[PDB]
């Protein structure tokens, strides 16, 4: 039923329940904060008021101290390897990994060193080989790149538009088809475009976009100046050797005033994920 | 208790009753301005708050001009306000608050030659008057003994904040009548916060530009945002609510709110703090 | 019976306890950000006895006045907003420091209240006589007794062997007697000359004076860590900078526990002192 | 339960529980004049953390030799009679000051008196494997198979700046790894980054380590208050000079606090990053 990767492998993996749901998305929200430091979120859309869309979006916990590699989201290819350190990690992990990368050769190698263990033929290749398999066949359930692309459609997404008082700049499409389908699709599940055109109607939903892509990897980064504040909630998450860090908090009176004002209207403050323009059509020509 | 202005109406929300700035009803609030009490929640997630006023805008995408327009300049307030519909009661407030001394004058003469007068409703009508004229005279900043801002001044650009530049749209705000500036810095949010120490960006984009026209919900650039909400035409688009049904999975995806609030100007805090805050005070800076 | 003075106008209890200290623990934390407290002395075997030492409790990241514990005569008018507090407390802090022309100019500025002219003028009589008759008690007049007095001793270490001390030693002289009294009653003399022998009891003082006043500054390289602990406004809010540690030993802590604790404090040391035949 | 050193043919009950200490405080005293204790500091976020530390109660002392609180190998043998002590544990010195001439000189004594019934060579010779061990459980580099790896630590301050603490470290390397991880115990760092956190904790270090020995403070002339052949027999007799009060007026400050009254050993540099 759950068809987290991490549910599949094997410790624990208390993967969110949702999981084992008809959504289908390749991880559970657990391990999207174990690696990715975001939820999966919804921004319903209407206007007969059906609530039709419902459309998934994506938001972050990106600490605004964070600099360098930690504004990286998701690694490139490039250098993935030295933003992980997989020996922090299971074999397993390990594994997965270099499967969505598609180290290969890595993958090779694990599997010429396991060949000449005992504990590898008797016991462990039936779990090698079934998780890889199944791995490998729930990508291949989507790989929309193969498959007569039978998952999803041409979609007519982009994320390339041009940032105004940019150059025409625009680059690593490529990068993103070479990342497994699997990916594209969660990113095709995690940011929305600012834009949308209808068939005979274009529509606007966001001031300005709040993410980019670099060539080394998906970051929330302001296209200038300094970052948002972002107040991670702090209500999730090793330190062997006793670890430390400054913080910057409230402090002061005054907030039973609050008591009756709570009645009105409350704004959630999360950091969304925007990028990029979408069409319908309205013939398939 | 009550005390919504338009109590004075010779109908407003219980809402109205709590003892706050806003000194209308939603209702009313709504019914002209188009425009709902809302408020911010602000954490440092400690579970340290701090919390401050919202208000979107609700003017319909496609309509433009005076219809972007919320509030108009006291130089063109009938332009918007059909006075001729509206009661000679209405027509008075405004003029009251825009200091139209002389068509206050006008219906103070208006008032004789309404023969009915005679009826001695003039009593009641006047008291009403009078007690419009009181919250007025409250607000009025100018008071000389009337406390004002000292560590905090807001501002209506960036630039405006951060050099004390010539803002026309800060110049014209303190031309306003003091009850109008006084409405605009309680409703309006700024992009970012100076702290006596730090700085704080809360969006990297404003919501919206204002200018001598008066009070503007438009845009800073591009197309207006997505805004939902008999010999007629309703006119209605409708769309492919195929009941794909996903709530099994999303119900418990967290939505975001599919509002347009304010993050309009530039706070600036930079004094020791003393804030005082339970009091509304006009506060000027 | 009440000692602190602040007690004629919340007072830490003991203020009302049998202290020889003028203060209240609570004013003088506020103030001076200092604790009262001892040290004990044996006679080189289990007889054993006292001397008060107060150790301040300034932050490690205080910086410029704020590493002054208690500014000089001039620089405190600067040093504390004294418009911040009730009027009775500015007469107060400007009778301790003889500012008496502002002690005047604070009785013309409550005259000058239509309402001065009734029993607010003898609650104000009341009290400003009494706290002028606790200052007279501490000022020196034929004072000859061992308590509240000293007598032209020194803690400049190299002109003590004179019977001398420098310009800096005589500052504190400059000041009211309750200041100095209060001031050597708080940090101990670092070296001492016994009518016997003279010693030394720490090699580092901890703490220096200036013509500026007090300064808990380190003589030398980086200030020293320094929690603030315990102790207000519903007027005021800001931020906090915290630093915090993880990785707890939380289960050795137990074994941990098993061995003599050794608390870290800045205790107050500078200087010298003569020492009188006791009895 | 757990036990010291000197659970070895009295122990004590500071040896019922050991963390890599492994001596009694009651022979710490005994050898060295000294006193095992912890250093709590906290931060008021509920951040209390501890560290190991010992202090010397041998201040006011005279030339040198009276309060010198750890020989070196150079002169161990000087300053302590080894006929204080018997059945080899002579030899359990030689090992750990690395005197390993004078461990077969008494291994020569050893195989002499073969002791077939008591077999006395396995006496002396299961502890002395049992030393063996456990000084390198202390190796001198604690490679990784050594439990217990240590962090970075320096002694000479001013090149430990530089992380290149010189002669006086050389020498600490050069003793035995069983002083060095005594030494951790004991002596609290000066200065301590904690990821480059250069944080200081005294005015001044106390201790000073010659390659003679630990010498209980750098100066000898402003000498610190301090209170506390034929042997077994001696007594000594003070006279004091000061007529006072009944120690009785005193009891005023029966209720205020009282800073400590010890003089711990800090000295140092250290670094932790990451
Ligand atoms: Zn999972
Ligand atoms: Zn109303
Ligand atoms: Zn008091
Ligand atoms: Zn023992």
Same mark, same amino acid.
């Given at each position: ?52 869309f419902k459309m998934t979006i994506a938001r ?87 498959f007569c692309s039978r998952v999803s459609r ?43 055109? &209808?068939?005979?109607?274009? *529509?606007?939903? %966001? @001031? ?5 892509? #670099?060539?080394?990897? +998906? ?17 999730? &998450?090793?330190?062997?050797? *006793?670890?430390? %860090? @400054? ?5 002061? #009176?005054?907030?039973? +005033? ?26 398939? @020509?």
């Amino acid at each position: 039923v759950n068809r987290c990767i991490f549910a599949s492998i094997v410790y624990k993996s208390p993967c969110s329940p949702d999981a084992y749901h008809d959504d289908g998305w390749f991880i559970c929200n657990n391990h999207l904060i174990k690696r990715f430091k975001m939820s999966k979120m919804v921004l319903p859309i209407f206007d007969e008021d059906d609530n039709q869309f419902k459309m998934t979006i994506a938001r972050h916990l990106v600490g605004n101290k964070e600099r360098g590699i930690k504004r990286i989201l998701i690694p490139s290819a490039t250098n993935y390897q030295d933003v992980f350190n997989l020996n922090s990690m299971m074999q397993a992990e390990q594994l997965i990994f270099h499967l969505i990368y598609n180290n290969e050769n890595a993958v090779n190698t694990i599997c010429d060193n396991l060949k000449y263990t005992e504990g590898f033929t008797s016991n462990t290749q039936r779990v090698i080989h079934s998780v890889y398999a199944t791995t490998k066949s729930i990508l291949d359930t989507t790989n929309p790149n193969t498959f007569c692309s039978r998952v999803s459609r041409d979609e007519l997404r982009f994320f390339d538009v041009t940032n105004a008082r940019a150059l025409r700049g625009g680059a690593g499409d490529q990068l993103f088809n070479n990342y497994s389908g699997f990916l594209q699709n969660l990113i095709r599940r995690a940011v929305a475009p600012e834009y949308l055109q &209808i068939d005979t109607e274009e *529509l606007r939903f %966001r @001031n300005c976009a709040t993410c980019i892509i #670099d060539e080394t990897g +998906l970051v929330a980064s302001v296209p200038d100046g300094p970052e948002l504040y972002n107040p991670i909630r702090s209500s999730d &998450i090793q330190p062997n050797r *006793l670890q430390i %860090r @400054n913080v910057l908090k409230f402090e002061g #009176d005054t907030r039973e +005033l609050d008591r009756t004002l709570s009645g009105y209207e409350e704004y959630p403050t999360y950091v969304p994920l925007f990028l990029g323009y979408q069409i319908i059509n309205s013939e398939n @020509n």
